């Protein structure tokens, strides 16, 4: 068996998805209390998209321009307000299904679940990671914009992503729910590129810990390296630097397996230099970097 | 861009999961209308597992022996029946969150989502396939039994799997929602084992057509093949025989790309010969067999 990518159950977020229409632009909105959050580029007409001025484009629009649909119910808009790259629409009706939630901003390497929606209607959910180059590997088609990413901790939904655009190489970019982009992108029709991605070293080590715990142990060795020595080799193969923070965060998985992080690094050094040498780890021929230490401690240990 | 491993939104299933307790044994149940479906082995002690006589263990139970909990609300058992390896508990309260649903028995190679649950609490959603040896790959632990697999096509929930047990290789076995096992397995702790696992050939081809529609052609070649000559090679790599049905099934992905399915088979043959040479297809450096022809058409427009 493969140690599978697990998404959070999505039901708490499903009850929050509405359709937002502004002329001929239709995409997804997040309905929490009496406010609908959606990408501000729903106001853009197509000619505007080239070089838009959003502040003067919003003054121009008025409440009745925004058609909001929760299933077969029309929400009446009674307010609009911009916040960075998200549009907040005040509606007449609070969402009776509003879960406990906060807005958070995740760091690169951290994972979250995405609820892909089209026309305010949820389509699918999958687990992914904020890449070091602030993009996400995924699958979004036309009408996917306004789709959100989140973590669940007890009954509390942490919303961390709103989807905005596709890049070259079929990867994706969006904002937190306060409308701030992840990575050096802007909401215009313009030539934009992710630029060189790196592997998430701390996640790879976590996934080697997950492997050891599920009995896959062939890559272990007698050697231990050091941070400076490991980072020399990491830097070479396009691997995020490993910091003393990373070592500390892996501490639990270290003590639960008797494999000191710097021993496992020696293992990883040897997999980067010599390759997989014919074998697999948890059924994968590549080193997986989209499981965090927390993910591995959750799904596995617990 | 877009052809990645996606589960269905789990919300319609989350509102059905409950906890079922009999003695010291607690597992998950599925609450649709006024019935709770769960694995019948809920009525077994750690001891009865080797040779349980289910009819004998069940005749000795009363409705009040079954503690069913929908979060904090205790449901009242007012009836009980056994269908194959599933226990059906009648309760006094219909589930008001019951979606539109049906029970379906799937064929090996079919995909579905699994809502993994512990103690009636959903933990996670993941997408998988009925392997050809009628097992499932993933991660269920102590607590996961009675977790269910489903598809959601246009608001109708099709329940096709309920989790029962783990087999020595760390693969998983279970039943349809009528309590009939997928495969030749029994709800019993006797050393049984899975037939050898083969690659779902029709699914890999679907995925090669997916890579082409997404604008990736590096693996294509000038050759075609006979069906018979393709299976003679593919069996040598432990690939499932391809049938006329698989070829009929792939028709629309062929027509859409103008690559005949026997020309795609020719590519796969060479992929099997050569490996990837450090290249990747839609992001993976192994051939992906848990995406069906139907899954490809749905995630393409
Ligand atoms: C988003 O705006 C959206 O879904 N809008 C509604 C809609 C659009 C089109 C047709 C019907 C309905 C989309 C989502 C994109 C499109 C396909 N995959 C996605 O994830 N985002 C954009 O269209 C986005 C808007 C920009 C930020 C303001 N955009 C515009 C122009 C170009 C691109 N990218 C692009 O062309 O990507 C490559 C890979 C270069 C082809 C883009 O995402
Ligand atoms: C299922 O009943 C369950 O979820 N257990 C409830 C529970 C236990 C402990 C505490 C709280 C709640 C389990 C699920 C299994 C076990 C671990 N992984 C799984 O997917 N089902 C069984 O344990 C099952 C019951 C048998 C069919 C009637 N069973 C019993 C005994 C042995 C095994 N298999 C086993 O030992 O697996 C190997 C791979 C050999 C370790 C088994 O599945
Ligand atoms: Cl892989």
From Swiss-Prot, chain B:
Reaction(s) catalysed (UniProt annotation): TSAVLQ-|-SGFRK-NH2 and SGVTFQ-|-GKFKK the two peptides corresponding to the two self-cleavage sites of the SARS 3C-like proteinase are the two most reactive peptide substrates. The enzyme exhibits a strong preference for substrates containing Gln at P1 position and Leu at P2 position
Subcellular location, record wording: Host cytoplasm; Host Golgi apparatus; Host nucleus
Activity regulation, per record: Inhibited by pyridone-containing alpha-ketoamides compounds 13a and 13b. In turn, alpha-ketoamide 13b (tert-butyl (1-((S)-1-(((S)-4-(benzylamino)-3,4-dioxo-1-((S)-2-oxopyrrolidin-3-yl)butan-2-yl)amino)-3-cyclopropyl-1-oxopropan-2-yl)-2-oxo-1,2-dihydropyridin-3-yl)carbamate) inhibits SARS-CoV-2 replication in human lung cells. Inhibited ex vivo by michael acceptor inhibitor N3. Inhibited ex vivo by compound 11a and 11b.
Active site residues of this protein: 41 (for 3cl-pro activity), 145 (for 3cl-pro activity)
Cross-link named Glycyl lysine isopeptide (Lys-Gly) (interchain with G-Cter in ubiquitin), sites: 5, 90
Ranges per topology, Cytoplasmic: 1-301
Assembly and interaction partners: 3CL-PRO exists as monomer and homodimer. Only the homodimer shows catalytic activity. Interacts with host FBXO22; this interaction promotes the proteasomal degradation of nsp5.
Protein name: 3C-like proteinase nsp5
Phylogenetic classification of the source organism: Viruses, Riboviria, Orthornavirae, Pisuviricota, Pisoniviricetes
Part of the intact protein present: 3264 to 3564 of 4405
């Amino acid at each position: 068996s493969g140690f599978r990518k697990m998404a959070f159950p999505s039901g708490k977020v499903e009850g929050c998805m509405v359709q937002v229409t502004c002329g001929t632009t239709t995409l997804n909105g997040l309905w929490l209390d009496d406010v609908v959050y959606c990408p501000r580029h729903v106001i853009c007409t197509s000619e505007d998209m080239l070089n838009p001025n959003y502040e003067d484009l919003l003054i121009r629009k008025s409440n009745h321009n925004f058609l909001v649909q929760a299933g077969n119910v029309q929400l009446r808009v009674i307010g609009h307000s911009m916040q960075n790259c998200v549009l907040k629409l005040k509606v007449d009706t609070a969402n009776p299904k509003t879960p406990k939630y906060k807005f958070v901003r995740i760091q690169p390497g951290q994972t979250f679940s995405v609820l892909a929606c089209y026309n305010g209607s949820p389509s699918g959910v999958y687990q992914c990671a904020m890449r070091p180059n602030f993009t996400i590997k995924g699958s979004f088609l036309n009408g996917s914009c306004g789709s959100v990413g989140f973590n669940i901790d007890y009954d509390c939904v942490s919303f961390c992503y709103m989807h905005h655009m596709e890049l070259p190489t079929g990867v994706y970019a969006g904002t937190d729910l306060e409308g701030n982009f992840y990575g050096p992108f802007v909401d215009r029709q313009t030539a934009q590129a992710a630029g060189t991605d790196t592997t998430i070293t701390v996640n790879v080590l976590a996934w080697l810990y997950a492997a050891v715990i599920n009995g896959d142990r062939w890559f272990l060795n007698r050697f231990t390296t050091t941070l400076n020595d490991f980072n020399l080799v990491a830097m070479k193969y396009n691997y995020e630097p490993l910091t003393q923070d990373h070592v500390d965060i892996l501490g639990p998985l270290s003590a639960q397996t008797g494999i000191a992080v710097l021993d496992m690094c020696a293992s990883l050094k040897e997999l980067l230099q010599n390759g997989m040498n014919g074998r697999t780890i948890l059924g994968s021929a590549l080193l997986e970097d989209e499981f965090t230490p927390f993910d591995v401690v959750r799904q596995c240990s617990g």
